[PDB]
Write a protein that binds this ligand. Structure first.
Ligand SMILES: [Ca+2]
Length: 880
């Protein structure tokens, strides 16, 4: 039949999914189906056809096209064909797209598929639009496997369909609709599909759709109703957004029980009808509006053939409501009535914006509903010079950006003609949804840009707590005769951008009517205190004394304004407090240093000494001569330093390096793979098996990587990695170097585990645990130069008390030929004890060159060049 013309879509809308297998004409076999899709009331704006694609129902499609559609159109109801996502791709159950012959994955093939799709599902029965179901159940598949190529192809075709129908199509009278279960960032079709659709329908069935899901790990609601909208707010307009609940489907199973309408009473066994809307999730969905952006397009219901049917009680999730009922659609009519009482959908009129040019701009850029003014958080640009009055701007509650451009007829700017969110504030919009507990979100103040207002005589921005004056093109405000920027948070110190803008306005005013206390106001400012991006004090030299030092207060300090003004101390702020403009300060009298300064109270430190020993104490004792590296951390990020400084107590000592990191395990009675983990440079993961062996006494024979002079060593207990360790700490320990003087190195390498015995080695230090808890042990070493080492750990407990050592550090400074340098300095000592062989005068000259080398070897500032020189002087002196 010929298509009855219908008025353009105008929300708030009600949609409904009518399942085809519940229309009388669908299956003549049964008679329990007493419902008809043509019986849907005028209250329904969108009648969706949800079909069982395995069924034929040829009698239904005829009834639909010839009787249902004319009846529904005449009352103003549109009929939309719902097709699966996979119908746009190919593969399993893809309908038309199964025939790859006529519709290949080509540009012209996709273009042909799009035409065939609208031909078959839209125009064939003269329907009012196409609805694409995009969810997991409708995903493109090939042999039951999800197909990326299919999904990617379905992004096209969709674009091609959109060129035929929808707001960007040839036939705009046909709607193009996407319904989905996905979030925007999980919907691969929304980004390129959104410009082609009229409406986006989100399925939010059940309490999980309403409240969102409770995420276990975070102790916080995820995927909430507001988050879902916010995700799609990037792609569509609020008026295109429709949320959905579900009626009770007969014989519904677990996973399909939503309870979006009132359940059956646990005693009323003979009744399956409950047309009451009171307390339902559907009634709450009808009244729900987004907090930002604007008012929604409306709501929709699934299984609208089950309208009026009570839900099966939750107690029976493993009935009278499972019978088939003849619906009169009371619930649908009731919900549409609720949405029509929503005053949010009242049109923005001349009362809101008396100026026609302004009213037009708002209607184009924001919306047409009064409730959009409460929610719009985008950008309103006013660059139409015709605008004579800004009356109505105060109606904006959440506006993000306002551009006043070239409006040369405006003579005054104040709070009465500016957005209500000029000053800070919280969300006042009430919530209608159930929650798991609603903390009022912070409404960001509107960013204001004013340029070209050449007729502006008064500018009043007082008492808005404005953070900055950025946006004011003061040079263009040539008619200014009065200004008031007092009572904000502006930093008006000289050299700042805020000051530049103010001075320009001041100059204009002085020339016009003269600058006085009634034409120029700027005081009572409370500038915000911020953390500096960088810190200047990277070095601190302290004398050796019996004093404790607060590292934070001496290295990590300072508060900066958003204009760049850095205040490092109360003295700096006092100098800031008497910055004068026209003889008086701009800073509020009650805004003191403690009110302005940021707090470093919860910052943490990491102090590393020259032996690479670490502490986390913010207080440093200067009773010992030591050089430190100090890292500072913010509470927000404990693994990333906001500032690094060097602290030198007494004479500076060069920072040592772990010469044992990356060493090679050669032997020793220990797990060779875990033994390598004491040299990896980390404490390891708590979950990692790091035990050296089974016996309580394990040993490790290893080789260093770089020639160096060893001056220290350190090993950690398991408690350094895990404070709650059950592993027994190391009781006895020995650090050893190879006895290369009395034994052959070659024998050691060819068979290492034969030399896993003390006699082949020389103990250079011994550790005996005192008893108290200790995360590590460290000790000094007297200039050791051995490439090959041996270490023995022992917990001295029972067996199965494995020696657990997260790291072994052998510290010192890099020095090539260190082994040889110590040879010639050792020979110098040997010859000095041969007093029967050389004269005292020959020895005294030698001792000078000997004590010259030792001084450079033990020099606090480690000089490799000087060491080489003093070693060369000595070696030539020993020859002969
Ligand atoms: Ca380790």
């Amino acid at each position: 039949p010929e298509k009855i013309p219908m008025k353009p879509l105008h929300g708030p809308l009600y949609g409904g999914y009518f399942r085809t297998w519940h229309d009388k004409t669908s299956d003549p076999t049964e008679k329990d189906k007493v419902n008809s899709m043509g019986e849907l009331p005028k209250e329904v704006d969108l009648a969706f056809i949800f079909h069982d694609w395995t069924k034929d129902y040829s009698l239904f499609w005829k009834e639909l096209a010839t009787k249902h559609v004319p009846k529904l159109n005449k009352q103003g109801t549109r009929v939309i064909r719902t097709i699966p996502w996979r119908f746009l791709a190919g593969g399993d159950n893809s309908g038309i797209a199964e025939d790859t012959s006529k519709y290949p994955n080509t540009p012209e093939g996709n273009k042909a598929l799009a035409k065939a799709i609208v031909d078959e599902y839209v125009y064939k029965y003269n329907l009012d639009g196409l609805d694409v179901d995009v969810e997991h159940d409708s995903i493109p598949k090939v042999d039951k496997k999800e197909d990326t190529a299919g999904v990617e192809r379905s992004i096209q075709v969709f674009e091609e369909i959109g060129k035929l129908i929808g707001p960007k199509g040839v036939d705009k009278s046909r709607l193009f609709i996407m319904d989905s279960t996905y979030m925007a960032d999980k919907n691969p079709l929304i980004e390129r599909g959104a410009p082609y659709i009229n409406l986006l329908l989100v399925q939010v069935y059940g309490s999980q759709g309403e409240k969102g899901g409770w995420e276990p790990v975070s102790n916080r609601p995820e995927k909430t109703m507001e988050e879902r909208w916010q995700g799609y707010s990037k792609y569509i307009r609020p008026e295109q957004y429709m949320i959905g609940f579900s009626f009770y489907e007969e014989n519904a199973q677990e996973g399909n029980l939503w309870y979006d309408i009132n359940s059956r009473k646990d005693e009323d066994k003979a009744n399956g009808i409950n047309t009451d809307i009171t307390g339902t999730r559907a009634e709450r969905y009808a009244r729900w509006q987004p907090k930002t952006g604007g008012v929604k397009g409306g709501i929709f219901s699934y299984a609208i053939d089950r309208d009026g049917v009570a839900h099966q009680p939750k107690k029976y999730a493993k009935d009278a409501t499972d019978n088939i009922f003849h619906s009169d659609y009371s619930v649908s009519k009731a919900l549409k009535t609720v949405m029509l009482k929503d005053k949010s959908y009242d049109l923005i009129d001349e009362k809101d914006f008396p100026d026609k040019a302004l009213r037009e701009a708002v209607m184009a850029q924001v919306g047409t509903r009064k409730g959009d003014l409460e929610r719009f958080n985008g950008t309103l640009r006013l660059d139409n010079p015709a605008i004579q009055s800004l009356e109505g701007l105060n109606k904006f509650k959440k506006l993000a950006q306002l551009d006043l451009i070239g409006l040369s007829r405006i003579t005054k700017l104040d709070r009465s003609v500016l957005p209500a969110n000029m000053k800070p504030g919280k969300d006042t919009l009430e919530t209608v949804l159930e929650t798991y507990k609603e903390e009022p979100a912070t409404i960001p103040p509107v960013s204001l840009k004013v340029s070209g207002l050449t007729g502006l005589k008064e500018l009043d921005l007082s008492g808005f707590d404005r953070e900055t004056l950025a946006g004011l093109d003061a040079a263009t405000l040539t008619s200014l005769e009065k200004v008031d920027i007092s009572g904000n948070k502006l930093d008006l110190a000289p050299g700042t951008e805020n000051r530049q803008i103010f001075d320009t306005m001041l100059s204009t005013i002085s020339n016009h009517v003269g600058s006085n206390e009634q034409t120029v106001k700027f005081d009572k400012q409370k500038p915000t205190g911020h953390y500096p991006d960088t810190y200047g004090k990277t070095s601190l030299r302290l004398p050796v004394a019996n004093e404790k030092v607060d590292l934070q207060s001496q290295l990590l300090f300072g508060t900066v304004t958003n204009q760049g003004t850095l205040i490092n101390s109360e003295a700096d702020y006092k100098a800031y407090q008497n910055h004068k403009i026209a003889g008086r300060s701009f800073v509020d009298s009650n805004y003191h240093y403690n009110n302005f300064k940021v707090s470093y109270e919860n910052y943490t430190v990491k102090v590393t000494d020259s032996t690479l020993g670490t502490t986390t104490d913010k207080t440093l004792a200067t009773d010992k001569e030591e050089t430190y590296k100090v890292d500072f951390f913010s509470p927000a990020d404990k693994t990333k330093a906001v500032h690094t400084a060097k602290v030198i107590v007494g004479d500076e000592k060069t920072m040592m390096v772990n010469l044992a990191e990356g060493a090679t395990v050669i032997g020793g009675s220990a797990d060779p793979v875990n033994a390598r983990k004491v040299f990896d440079g980390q404490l390891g993961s708590e979950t990692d098996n790091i035990s050296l062996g089974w016996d309580s006494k394990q040993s490790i024979i290893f080789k260093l990587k770089e020639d160096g002079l060893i001056k220290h060593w350190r090993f950690f207990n398991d408690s350094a990695r895990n404070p709650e360790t059950t592993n027994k700490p190391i009781q006895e320990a020995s650090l050893q170097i190879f006895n290369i003087k009395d034994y052959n190195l070659d024998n050691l390498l060819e068979n290492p585990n034969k030399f896993d015995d003390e006699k082949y080695w020389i103990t250079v230090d011994t550790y005996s645990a005192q008893g108290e808890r200790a995360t590590a042990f460290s000790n000094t070493l007297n200039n050791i130069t051995s490439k090959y080492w041996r270490v023995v750990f022992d917990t001295k407990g029972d067996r199965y008390s494995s020696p657990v050592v997260p790291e072994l550090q052998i510290l010192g400074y890099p020095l090539p030929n260190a082994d040889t340098i110590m040879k010639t300095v050792t020979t110098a000592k040997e010859l000095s004890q041969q007093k029967d062989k050389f004269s005292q005068k020959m020895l005294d000259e030698l001792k000078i060159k000997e004590m010259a080398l030792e001084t450079s070897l033990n020099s606090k500032i480690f000089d490799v060049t000087a060491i080489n020189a003093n070693a060369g002087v000595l070696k030539d002196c020993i020859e002969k």
